[PDB]
Amino acid sequence: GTGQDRVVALVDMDCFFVQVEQRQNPHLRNKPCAVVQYKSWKGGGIIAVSYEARAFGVTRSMWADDAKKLCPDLLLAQVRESRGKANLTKYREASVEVMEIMSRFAVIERASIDEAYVDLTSAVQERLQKLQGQPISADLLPSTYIEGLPQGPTVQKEGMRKQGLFQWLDSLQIDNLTSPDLQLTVGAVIVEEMRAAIERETGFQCSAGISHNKVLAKLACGLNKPNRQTLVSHGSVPQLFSQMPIRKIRSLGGKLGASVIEILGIEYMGELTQFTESQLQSHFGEKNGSWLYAMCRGIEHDPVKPRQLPKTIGCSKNFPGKTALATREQVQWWLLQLAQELEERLTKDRNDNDRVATQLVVSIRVQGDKRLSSLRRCCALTRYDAHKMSHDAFTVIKNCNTSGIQTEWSPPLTMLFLCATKFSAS
DNA sequence: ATATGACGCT
DNA sequence: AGCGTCAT
Numbered sequence: 001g002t003g004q005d006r007v008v009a010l011v012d013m014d015c016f017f018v019q020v021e022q023r024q025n026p027h028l029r030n031k032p033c034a035v036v037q038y039k040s041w042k043g044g045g046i047i048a049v050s051y052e053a054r055a056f057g058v059t060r061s062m063w064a065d066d067a068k069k070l071c072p073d074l075l076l077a078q079v080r081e082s083r084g085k086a087n088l089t090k091y092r093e094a095s096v097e098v099m100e101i102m103s104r105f106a107v108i109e110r111a112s113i114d115e116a117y118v119d120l121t122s123a124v125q126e127r128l129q130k131l132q133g134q135p136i137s138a139d140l141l142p143s144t145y146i147e148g149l150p151q152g153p154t155v156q157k158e159g160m161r162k163q164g165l166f167q168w169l170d171s172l173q174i175d176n177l178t179s180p181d182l183q184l185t186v187g188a189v190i191v192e193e194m195r196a197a198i199e200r201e202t203g204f205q206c207s208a209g210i211s212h213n214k215v216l217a218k219l220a221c222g223l224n225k226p227n228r229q230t231l232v233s234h235g236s237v238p239q240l241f242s243q244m245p246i247r248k249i250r251s252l253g254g255k256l257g258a259s260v261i262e263i264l265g266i267e268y269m270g271e272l273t274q275f276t277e278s279q280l281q282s283h284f285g286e287k288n289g290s291w292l293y294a295m296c297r298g299i300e301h302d303p304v305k306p307r308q309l310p311k312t313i314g315c316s317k318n319f320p321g322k323t324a325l326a327t328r329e330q331v332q333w334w335l336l337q338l339a340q341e342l343e344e345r346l347t348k349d350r351n352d353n354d355r356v357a358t359q360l361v362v363s364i365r366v367q368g369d370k371r372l373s374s375l376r377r378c379c380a381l382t383r384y385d386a387h388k389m390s391h392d393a394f395t396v397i398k399n400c401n402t403s404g405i406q407t408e409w410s411p412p413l414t415m416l417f418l419c420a421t422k423f424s425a426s
Numbered sequence: 427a428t429a430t431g432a433c434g435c436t
Numbered sequence: 437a438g439c440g441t442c443a444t
């Protein structure tokens with residue numbers, strides 16, 4: 001097919017953790033500010049950056065002391081620390097605020113703490129029927145960009161936006177209820193309403209992409225951040241993809257996308273069209289090969305999954321450098337700190353969402369291993385009891401200690417991770 | 427010494 | 437089941 005069957009939107013909050021802190025603390029609003037984790041080592045690690053601070057070159061992962069060199073007036077909000085660890089509860093609860101608003105408009109797939117996909121196909125059909133072929137006024141799309149427009153025969157971005165939108169709407173054929181471009185346009189009208197409700201009811205601004213599938217919706221979202229939304233039509237794909245680096249497409253940002261560029265000797269998504277589906281399958285596998293063949297034409301069939309809640313609840317802490325855990329008592333104490341946070345999050349989850357986790361995953365990283373995880377083990381999660389969860393976690397990992405002195409722990413542990421999974425309705 | 431969470435591979 | 441990949 002032509003991959004125009006659905007209307008799919010991705011809504012992503014703008015500098016989300018910063019907005020959460022700026023709502024709470026109005027003295028941070030409209031200023032270069034960032035959210036920082038910990039403090040002692042180089043001022044802490046930055047994990048979110050306001051757009052005023054991005055202009056100075058402040059970025060994620062940057063040390064706060066280094067960010068202050070680029071932006072001396074940078075304001076910092078620190079992530080909460082509980083039981084010796086970062087605690088992200090404030091941001092999870094703000095995320096729930098947003099997701100429950102989005103859910104009023106259509107079923108959502110929670111894709112991260114700050115973004116969800118929406119399938120608007122049904123909602124579009126209903127608005128199209130409630131409207132009666134009445135044209136769509138530009139006033140209904142006050143923050144929408146039409147990628148690829150304006151085009152053809154002034155110098156301010158808002159003026160450009162309106163010129164593109166006018167061109168788009170002037171060419172739209174509303175007599176055809178099945179026109180994909182009309183469907184996208186109605187989808188964008190709905191997303192305007194959804195974004196307005198989010199801002200009114202939470203104070204948070206967001207951006208969105210509207211297209212026919214997840215990949216295009218995600219790409220569109222980022223094209224005019226912040227506080228704007230972008231419609232990427234099927235027709236816009238050839239020009240858009242002709243200069244689009246492969247690594248910008250969701251799932252091609254790692255080794256697979258590197259192999260595509262390396263093996264095929266290309267750089268842009270549109271260059272993939274010159275290969276047969278079998279060719280791509282030969283290099284990258286049947287699944288990936290078929291996916292790439294469709295995707296480079298703007299076609300992708302990954303459905304918006306109805307999932308509003310995370311399906312796992314985890315707690316993790318790294319122990320870098322000299323802080324690596326080297327004694328049994330140290331491992332036990334931190335496993336308990338993690339287990340205690342997990343217990344309170346699990347208890348809250350059960351009351352909120354009428355479900356219980358049944359499996360506990362335990363993962364550690366050993367000193368020197370660059371892998372995210374060095375070993376993973378599981379056991380039953382029978383009761384929401386921190387001491388039992390930490391005791392069981394130690395049982396399943398205690399043989400990894402290659403030390404003739406049992407009071408010590410070698411090799412030193414550089415990460416502990418506890419994750420509750422396999423939820424069942426309760 | 428750049429805390430999570432979903433899904434793929436075997 | 438346990439590890440690998442990619443994401444935010």
Ligand SMILES: Nc1ccn([C@H]2C[C@H](O)[C@@H](COP(=O)(O)NP(=O)(O)OP(=O)(O)O)O2)c(=O)n1
Pocket residue numbers: 012013014015016017018047048049060113114225226444
């Ligand atoms: N690698 C990352 C990316 C994001 N996050 C957190 C902080 C972000 O505010 C929040 C949302 O991630 P994000 O959407 O990728 N970036 P953010 O919303 O901060 O700025 P935008 O570029 O979306 O406007 O997740 C993180 O902790 N580690």
Ligand SMILES: [Mg+2]
Pocket residue numbers: 012013014015016114
């Ligand atoms: Mg965001």
Ligand SMILES: [Mg+2]
Pocket residue numbers: 012013112114115444
């Ligand atoms: Mg995001």
Ligand code: NA
Pocket residue numbers: 351352353
């Ligand atoms: Na509830």
Ligand code: NA
Pocket residue numbers: 443444
């Ligand atoms: Na990402």
